[PDB]
Structure 1
Amino acid sequence: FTLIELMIVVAIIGILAAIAIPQYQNYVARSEGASALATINPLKTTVEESLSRGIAGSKIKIGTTASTATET
């Protein structure tokens, strides 16, 4: 092992560092907003259809309970 060998390794370590890391939280925030909008968008169909069929607005709830003829 020579000192030139180790100094070249140190220089290449420094060069391999310093790689600029761009902003990434904006991408995550935008994806979260898109996911939320895509999650709550189909619920417009449920509310509108239930209101069209006469189901009371107070009877339109959120859950996995089996919807009856009066509750959705």
Structure 2
Amino acid sequence: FTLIELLIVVAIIGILAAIAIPQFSAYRVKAYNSAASSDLRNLKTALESAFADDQTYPPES
């Protein structure tokens, strides 16, 4: 509308364009880690189930 109105908008667009976007890197690597430790604690039950069938842990591959 008025030149002064178009001077507040550009003064607010500048504000709302920098709101300290956080580093969402550590908060995701923790999920990837806790998939692998879960997966290992599960894998152990398969190994120690298979031993109590065969008196041996499985052959590799």
- Identify the residue that residue 27 of structure 1 maps to in structure 2: 27
- Cα pair distance change 1:60/1:42, threshold 3 Å: farther
Give the AA of the match of 2:42.
Answer: P
- Identify the residue that residue 16 of structure 1 maps to in structure 2: 16
Identity of matched residues, %:
46
**Aligned-pair CA distance for 1:58:** 3.7
For 1:33 and 1:14, the matched residues in 2 are separated by: 38
In the superposition, the TM-score normalised over structure 1's length comes to 0.70
Matches within 5 A, 1:37-56: 37-54=37-54, 56=56
Structure 1 stretches of 4+ with a deviation exceeding 2 A read: 55-61
SS in structure 2 at match of 1:15: coil
In the superposition, the TM-score normalised over structure 2's length comes to 0.80
RMSD: 1.9
- Identify the residue that residue 6 of structure 2 maps to in structure 1: 6
**Aligned-pair CA distance for 1:24:** 1.2
Aligned length: 61
